[PDB]
Design a binder for this molecule. Structure first.
Ligand SMILES: [Mg+2]
Ligand SMILES: [Mg+2]
Ligand SMILES: [Mg+2]
Ligand SMILES: [Mg+2]
Ligand SMILES: [Mg+2]
Ligand SMILES: [Mg+2]
Length: 114
RNA sequence: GAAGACUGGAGUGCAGAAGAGGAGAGUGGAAUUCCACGUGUAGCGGUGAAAUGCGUAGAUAUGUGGAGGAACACCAGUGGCG
């Protein structure tokens, strides 16, 4: 409405972008798979470019001049989408890293190729 | 072998110090999974490439509460104790 927030999760397989309110309910979303990418083409920064553009440009109807980006996931598609959202008109107030680091909680799945 | 003597071995007392040494009872936070709720739309997941799999009974993402189990981020170092 006036100032929402943007959630992004660009893992090594996909880039999902979110736009919500400041109290945190969904408005519009897009993904690298929604644009027609089949193989591992999702993980590229360019697929994140199209996802970010198509998600920010569809947030115009809701109405938002400011937003903040919360970046989660270890993939290679964060800066691209952050810049694409910032360069569509809405200025990103601040950027945060929200990766879920555990304090040695539960054992991870076994190492690959053994 | 026997009878004595000594303190440089061994032990006791006195004054200090460090420590993931052991056993019993009780509390803490972050995170994974499950459950309920509010917008929320067509995909999510995964590989070198895919498919099986989950998803219009409406998933992923998304904020708010509840349950349970296991291991203890930084400190952390050919550091410490046995
Ligand atoms: Mg002595
Ligand atoms: Mg919890
Ligand atoms: Mg599982
Ligand atoms: Mg949920
Ligand atoms: Mg929760
Ligand atoms: Mg020793």
């Amino acid at each position: 409405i006036e100032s929402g927030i943007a959630h992004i999760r660009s893992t090594f397989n996909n880039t999902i972008v979110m736009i919500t309110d400041t109290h945190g309910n969904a408005l519009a979303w897009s993904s690298a798979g929604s644009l027609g990418f089949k193989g591992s083409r999702k993980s590229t920064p360019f697929a994140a470019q199209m996802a970010a553009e198509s998600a920010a440009k569809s947030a115009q109807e809701h109405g938002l001049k400011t937003l903040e980006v919360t970046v989660k996931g270890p993939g290679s598609g964060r800066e691209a989408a952050i810049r694409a959202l910032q360069a569509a008109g809405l200025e990103v107030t601040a950027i945060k890293d929200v990766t879920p680091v555990p304090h040695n909680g539960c054992r991870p799945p076994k190492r690959r190729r053994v």
